[PDB]
Copies of this chain bind each other. A is one copy, B any other.
Amino acid sequence: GTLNQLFHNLNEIVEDLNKNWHRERRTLHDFADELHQLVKHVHHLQDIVNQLDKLFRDLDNHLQRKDDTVHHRHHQLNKLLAQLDNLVHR
């Protein structure tokens, strides 16, 4: 029974982790895209336009790097769940 309760709980937490990243990724991409707009609205003030670019690039870097980190943790978490699943239904 306990093992099943661990599987169930962890299963929810894993799902919650992946849904929150789906959400955050969207939120930060829109954020990125609005910086990107702003760069064009400016260019259409030399310190400023350059700062917007940098920020756009920082955030892009972060999203790419987090995406890779999330991919890797999700895979490890799914393998763990599989093992748990097998153990409870054994």
User: Which residues on A are within 8 Å of B, measured CB to CB?
Assistant: 2-3, 5-6, 9-10, 13, 16-17, 20, 24, 27-28, 31, 34-35, 37-38, 41-42, 47-48, 51-52, 54-55, 58-59, 62, 66, 69, 73, 76-77, 80, 83-84, 87
Contacts and interface: CB of A to CB of B under 8 A. Distances in A.
A34 B55 contact: yes
Contacts of A73: 13, 16-17, 20
A31 B84 CA distance: 39
A76 B34 CA distance: 34
A7 to B, nearest CB: 10
A59 to B, nearest CB: 7
A83 B6 contact: yes
A41 B31 contact: no
10 contacts: A5-B83, A6-B80, A6-B83, A9-B80, A10-B10, A13-B77, A13-B80, A20-B69, A34-B54, A37-B51
